[PDB]
């Protein structure tokens, strides 16, 4: 469950970074 | 003064997403640190058991 939590953290961080850079690109 | 705080409030509006994301990431990382500490303690205790 620790590995699952770390994967959740990584994917959430990556998705937020991607969406903020998309929102600032436009 | 009015223009200063117009741009200041506009700044605070912009970082609404980033502040929430940072807060949630900080909470997640603190949780994961405490999980790692518990896992290390259990692992060492079990190792000396074995």
Encoding tokens for residue B28?
């997640």
* Residues belonging to chain A with any Cβ–Cβ distance to chain B shorter than 8 Å: 1-2, 5-6, 8-9, 12-13, 16, 20, 23
Give the whole-angstrom CA distance, residue B2 versus residue B8: 10
Give the whole-angstrom CA distance, residue A21 versus residue B7: 22
**Measured between CA atoms, how close is A9 to chain B, in angstroms?**
7
Resolution of this structure in Å: 3.9
Instruction: Identify whether the C-beta of residue B18 lies closer than 8 Å to the C-beta of residue A20.
Output: yes
Positive or negative torsion for Cα B34, B35, B40, B42: positive
Burial group, residue B32, by CB count within 10 angstroms (0-12, 13-18, 19+):
middle
Q: Which residue of A has its CA nearest to B17?
A: A20
Give the whole-angstrom CA distance, residue B49 versus residue B38: 16
Instruction: Identify whether the C-beta of residue B17 lies closer than 8 Å to the C-beta of residue A20.
Output: yes
CA distances from B9 to A15, A22, B2, B15, B28 (A): 27, 23, 11, 10, 29
């Amino acid at each position: 469950d620790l590995m699952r939590r770390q994967e959740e953290l990584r994917r959430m961080e990556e998705l937020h970074n991607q969406e903020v850079q998309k929102r600032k690109q436009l | 003064v009015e223009k200063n705080m117009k741009d200041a409030k506009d700044k605070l509006e912009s970082e609404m997403e980033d502040a929430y994301h940072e807060h949630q990431a900080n909470l997640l990382r603190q949780d994961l640190m405490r999980r790692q500490e518990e896992l290390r303690r259990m692992e060492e205790l079990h190792s000396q058991e074995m």
